[PDB]
Amino acid sequence: EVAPSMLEITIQNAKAYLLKT
Amino acid sequence: MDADSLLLSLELASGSGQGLSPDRRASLLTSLMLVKRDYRYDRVLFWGRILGLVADYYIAQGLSEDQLAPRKTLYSLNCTEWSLLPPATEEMVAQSSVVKGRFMGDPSYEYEHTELVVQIKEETRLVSVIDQIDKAVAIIPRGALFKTPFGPTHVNRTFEGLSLSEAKKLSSYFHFREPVELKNKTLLEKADLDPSLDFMDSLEHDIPKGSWSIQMERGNALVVLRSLLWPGLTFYHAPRTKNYGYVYVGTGEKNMDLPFML
């Protein structure tokens, strides 16, 4: 498995922050 | 230990008992903002006091727009007349490492050492002692600074202070200098850290282990980190606010008996 990119990790962090209620 | 909140800093760091006189306190409050304009500093930090046999060295520094830039050191003997100090090199430290004892208090005083007679000034010794303390036991909390992708590091204006859980942990405090061990850290360890927040070396991996005596003065409303590698250093932190700072009041001698001491 390829490690996720720093761009992808920041995208997941940005998506999860917008998912915060 | 900002000059704008120096009075609050001295009142909070007075829990270590090494305060200052109202003569020296108000002289410091006025003279730091004088040094701030006279050298056009963005911020001015009161370093602390190096005790002596006749007089006490009162040390402070100024900073540029970049918070990680090399700072400029100034010293005083009565908290009024401030004189700048030269930067240190490797030969500068290597000369000064052989001098032991307390400071006389006179910047023109000189120490004689026999090498297998090298003259080593007290101002020469003062500069190296300040720089050795600055590289070793400087503390800044996590999130106080953010590093832009352009390269300069600025003060985070959204920094609301550490939480109650993070203030009790040594990993939330970082060295206030350029990273050293972070470059040696592996890529797997680098994947979990924020490049804009975790760009410094943490106090959890400080050498030696257990060099920080973290204490709860007024019940972690004031978080007091006292250095054990350098006695007389007290760093205060007030959680959920912007109050922070460190002060060194001592003889300027390393506690290299720390393995014997722990």
């Binding site: - | 050498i207 030696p208 282990k209 257990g210 008996d257 720390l258 393995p259 722990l262």
Partner: protein, 210 residues
Amino acid sequence: LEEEGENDIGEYEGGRNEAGERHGRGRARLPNGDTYEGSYEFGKRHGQGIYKFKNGARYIGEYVRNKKHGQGTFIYPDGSRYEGEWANDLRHGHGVYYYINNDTYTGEWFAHQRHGQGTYLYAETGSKYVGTWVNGQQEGTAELIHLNHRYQGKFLNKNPVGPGKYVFDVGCEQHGEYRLTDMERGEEEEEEELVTVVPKWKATQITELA
């Protein structure tokens, strides 16, 4: 006392060979007041036996031709004792010495002296000196281990020398050096001026446990 009276034999109870010499297991009361109980061979001691001296000294172990040999336990009249190998009435091989104040030395032996690797535990403190022994003096690479710490470095004439480091249980090491510093000039009575070599620790760096 090893100059035998060839005509003063003393008391003996045990077997004898065809030549009249003492053989086999027997008990002999020697003319110096000492007593022995053990096996004999051709009028000489051989094998296991117990030799009890006059003042309270006693050896339990093997003997070979009027000389102590093999494993043996000697309990000295001062209350100290040694348990280990013997060779020609000398402390040899590996052995344990229990001293007069419950100090325990455990290690090699050579000609009644502490030699080779050895561990000397001080009973009053609890520190153990683990390292090379040369003629009963502290020398070579050695470890002074006490409670939560150990010094790892070199020794010389019971004065530790040179570079070394202290390893503590909290997770740290302290690298420095020992300098042999001769400032104590004894104003005692005029008898054999002893250079009281005082080693001073001078640390240079502190490291974590790797």
